[PDB]
Design a protein around this ligand. Structure first.
Ligand code: TTP
Ligand code: MN
Ligand code: NA
Ligand code: NA
Length: 327
DNA sequence: CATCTG
DNA sequence: CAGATG
């Protein structure tokens, strides 16, 4: 956790570069398991050879470790941080909608900066365009003091649309969190579940209301169950407007709300543990259900859930406030 | 995983 | 449809 930090760090830099700049998925993946296992390792790696002893640890990585340990740097690592092409790709990628793949093509055509992109706004698709337009807004975190206003917003509209809606703002917001990065709304309705063959309106009618009132500003992606978009809190009495915030709405069959709700509420760490325990208690949990584990090796059969309560219970645990859902 | 693109 | 993004 700090005993082999630098090693796991340079390791991740190296790994990440493989995938992003080069295409070395294998290589990339290599650096990863490596950084993974050295992270667990209980000692203070004093040498290459020592590391090597580890699985996932080959001759090449060991080489790297050695040089790093020996000299506070790494040449390859140094050379990579200089390289324009590499830095360019790391940057482009910052734009929502731009992935490494596209990051390469742009750079190859010479688009390396923001200006570059504006100049060639023609080459970008919608998401990408939006991504570019709200570059800055996009990177700003979200003060919960804002979140509450928004949550307040969304909730009132869904309500006015159909009283049977059930909306939940999951995320860190849900877990206390002073600020968040984006707004996750989980949605369900009684009229929608496992078997119930579809109902798009379900999602589209609200999306619509939200835009209606001008909360939703753009659309990144709009499928029949998940909607990716842009939104913003009405600027009061013009002098101080709000940054555009990224939002995500998503349909959930009533019979699988709380699992996802639970789930999405994170944090990863809270999840797994809850997950590992579910296991002991003779169960299973994933993003939509909690099944009773048979013994034959495994089994199934979606247990019925009416609240986040029903799930803890199940695993015979202490119902945890969302706030404390920490780790 | 679900959606967009081309 | 394969392949990209989030
Ligand atoms: C899991 C991790 C999160 O709890 C959730 C997925 O939502 P994300 O938006 O990926 O994460 P988040 O809500 O934790 O982050 P943010 O600070 O951006 O709001 O499921
Ligand atoms: Mn979020
Ligand atoms: Na991006
Ligand atoms: Na292939």
């Amino acid at each position: 956790e700090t005993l082999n930090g630098g090693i796991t760090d340079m390791l991740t830099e190296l790994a990440n570069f493989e995938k992003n700049v080069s295409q070395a998925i294998h290589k990339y993946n290599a650096y990863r398991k490596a950084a993974s296992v050295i992270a667990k390792y209980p000692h203070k790696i004093k040498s290459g050879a020592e590391a090597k002893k580890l699985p996932g640890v080959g001759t090449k990585i060991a080489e790297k470790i050695d040089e790093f340990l020996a000299t506070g740097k790494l040449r390859k690592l140094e050379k990579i941080r200089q390289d324009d092409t590499s830095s360019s790709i790391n940057f482009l990628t910052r734009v929502s909608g731009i992935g490494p793949s596209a990051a390469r093509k742009f750079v190859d055509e010479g688009i390396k900066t923001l200006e570059d992109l504006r100049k060639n706004e023609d080459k970008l698709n919608h998401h990408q365009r939006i991504g570019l337009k709200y570059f800055g807004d996009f990177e700003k975190r979200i003060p919960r003091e804002e979140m509450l206003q928004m949550q307040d917003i969304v909730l009132n509209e869904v309500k006015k649309v159909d009283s049977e809606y059930i909306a939940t703002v999951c995320g860190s917001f849900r877990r206390g969190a002073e600020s968040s990065g984006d707004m996750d709304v989980l949605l369900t309705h009684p009229s929608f579940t496992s078997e119930s063959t579809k109902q798009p309106k379900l999602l589209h009618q609200v999306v619509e209301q939200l835009q209606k009132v001008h909360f939703i500003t753009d659309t990144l992606s709009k499928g029949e169950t998940k909607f990716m978009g842009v939104c913003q809190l009405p600027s009061k009495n013009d002098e101080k407007e709000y940054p555009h915030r990224r939002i995500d709405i998503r349909l959930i069959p009533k019979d699988q709300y709380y699992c996802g709700v639970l789930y999405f509420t994170g944090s990863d760490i809270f999840n797994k543990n809850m997950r590992a325990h579910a296991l002991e208690k003779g169960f299973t949990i994933n993003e939509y259900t909690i099944r009773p584990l048979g013994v034959t090796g495994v089994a199934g059969e979606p247990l019925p859930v009416d609240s986040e309560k029903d799930i803890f219970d199940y695993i015979q645990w202490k119902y945890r406030e969302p706030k404390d859902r920490s780790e």
